Structure formats: C-alpha cells, structure tokens
Amino acid sequence: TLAELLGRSRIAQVANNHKPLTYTGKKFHPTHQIIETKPSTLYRQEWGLKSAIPSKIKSRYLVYNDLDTLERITTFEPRGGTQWNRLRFQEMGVPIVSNIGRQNPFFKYISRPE
C-alpha cells in the first residue's frame, strides 16, 4: 500500500527534529541530519524535499526542520559542517578511550551483577 511505502521512504528515515537551527549555546555533537544533493540535482534545485531549494544556495549540504510551514518556506540552513569535524577526527587517528576503564559499548560482553 501507499502507507507502507511512505513509512520506508527516505523522508520518513529522517527522525523528527525541531531543535533550533540557529543555536548559540554549547555544541558537543551534531543535532541535525545533514542532507546532501548530487551536483546534477543541485542544478535543478532538487534535494528530495517537498519544495525546490532557492537557487541562491550553492552548497550541496543542508540541515532542515520542517518540509513546509505557514510562512510557505522550508526551514533549513545550507551547512553540513559537522561531517568535516568527524572526518578530521578520523584523520588524527586517536582512538576514543574510557577514562573509567568501562567495557567497550560496541561489543556484546557477558556482564554480571557486580
């Protein structure tokens, strides 16, 4: 059915987020999912959102909150810069270690009631 397809659509895959797109507090990790469009689609203002992104946007990365609003605009910011922070961390090749010597969370360890 159409409902089944919609639930699995790429737009459905992005978790609902209404966090401020302009946040001036302390940032410790990414808050919005970066959206990327290919160069061919960018030439046609196609991002896979509800409406065409304004042609003024030359970046290929954005973050958004609402597909449409009462102001008849998309709420988005044309930035994708948290990906470069992650890739620069990867280039520094420093593994993240636990200062408390806890078990690795990414391994299925056999824990006990200690």
Binding site: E36, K38, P39, S40, R60, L87, Q90, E91
Partner: protein, 257 residues
C-alpha cells in the same frame, strides 16, 4: 549499483577462456569473479553517496586527491584497470557470436610503431616488450599493474604501479615501493612531485595530468597464479604482450581526424 559489464563472445570466454593466455578457470577468476567482487564492494562503499552516479574512471579522478577516500579510489582504479586489461587481451571486441568468426589477425599499426621508435631511441617493438617484462619483474614485488602510457608530449613510456595505482594521475601512480629502500634519485622524483602538487592553487590540491594508457597488463595473483603459478609471472606477461588485441590498442592512440 555498479554492475559487471557484459563482454563480447561471453559464451566462448566461459568455455575456452582466452586462447594462449588464460584458461576457462583462469578467466573466471580474473573477470567473472574478481570483477564481481570489485563492483559489489564499490557499490557498498558508494551507495547512498553522490559517487554512485559516476563511472569508475570518474570516481577515481574525483577521489584521487582525498586521503580518506583511498579505499573508494582503490576499488575504482582496480575496476577500471581490470577492464582495460581484459579489453586489450580479448580475442575480438566485436561480437562474432552469430558470425562464428575465427580469423582475428591484429597487428601493430604504423602510428604505434612510429611512436615506439621515436620514444625508445629506435628500439623495436620486440625489444620494448623485453623491457616491459623486465620492468614488471624488478619493480612490482607483489600485486600491481604494467602500463604502456602516452603523455602530453606524444612520447610512449612504461609505467608500473603497485597494487591499484592509476596511470592517469601521477600523484597516485604508486610506482615507488617505500616499504623497501629507495635511492637518492627516487627520493628526488618523489620530492619534485610533492613540489608540483603544492604549486596548485585549487582548494582540492589537484594537478593536471594528461597521461593515458595504451596497454594494460594485470599483475595481480587473480590473473596468473591458477594457470602459471608462483614465480612464473614473467611467462604470463610474455604471453599477454604477444597476444594483444591491436584493434583496441591502436584505437587508444589519438590520430586526429
């Protein structure tokens, strides 16, 4: 999704391999298995990204300058190189499946043999083949690729790559093995290359290289071991260079008409 290209006369290739070079089992390893292995890994690496809509040759150029995309570059370079090798060693590029053609006598063209003499100080094609076999045995300790390339100055020269090294982009030719020791002359070449890459003003730190391959020989174990065995890779390279498809190799040389 990147899919393995269909090859001309594929039924013959799956039955009698490539005559005088590979058997049926040897060709299944190099192309039907390894090419599937590469394309699947490339699809897993690039699916969901902008690179999925680009052909492997364009992917390697786009990613050649990105250190953390080397895995994608290696897969794209290997995929492009393997079909360059399988294309010039193929009995016939045209599909004589319904024409049952068994007479394909391809010989070096006049333009190729004229550029060989010009670029190799009058050496004949046979002598150049011996230099190519020698270069492969002494410069490629393990996996790699042997190329006959043409540069912007119309000169044919021999390039060898380690593992998946592209002939198109000199910063990624991977012609020097730094695991072993290098001479001061090799270090000078590397130092000069680094200076050229630093003169580029582009924010992507990319340079212009117009080198193009003419002949490609796969020096990976996936191509020779099963039929020749460890240590007999020079007998494999000799057979490949003696049974090249010159309809393809001649077409790779720019004529200008």
């Amino acid at each position: 999704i990147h899919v393995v290209p269909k090859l001309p006369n594929s039924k013959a290739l799956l039955q009698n391999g490539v005559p005088n070079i590979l058997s049926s089992s040897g060709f299944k390893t190099v192309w039907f298995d390894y090419q599937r292995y590469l394309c699947d890994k490339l699809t897993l690496a690039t699916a969901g990204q902008s690179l999925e809509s680009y052909y492997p040759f364009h992917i390697l150029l786009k990613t050649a300058g990105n250190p953390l995309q080397s895995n994608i570059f290696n897969l794209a370079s290997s995929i492009h190189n393997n079909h360059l090798f399988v294309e010039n060693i193929l009995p016939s590029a045209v599909e004589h499946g319904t024409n049952s053609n068994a007479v394909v006598k391809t010989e070096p063209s006049r333009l190729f043999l004229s550029k060989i003499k010009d670029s190799f100080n009058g050496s004949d094609w046979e002598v150049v083949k011996e230099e190519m076999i020698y270069r492969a045995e002494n410069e490629v300790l393990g996996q790699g690729w042997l190329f006959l390339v043409e540069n912007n100055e119309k000169k044919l020269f021999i390039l060898t790559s380690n593992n998946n090294g592209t002939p198109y982009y000199f910063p990624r030719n991977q012609s020097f093995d730094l695991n072993s020791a290098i001479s001061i002359d090799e270090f000078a070449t590397l130092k000069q290359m680094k200076e050229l890459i630093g003169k580029s003003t582009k924010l992507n730190g990319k340079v212009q290289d117009w080198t193009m391959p003419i002949i490609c020989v796969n020096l990976w174990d996936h191509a020779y071991l099963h039929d020749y065995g460890v240590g007999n890779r020079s007998k494999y390279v000799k057979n490949v260079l003696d049974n090249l498809n010159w309809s393809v190799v001649n077409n790779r040389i720019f004529s200008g008409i």
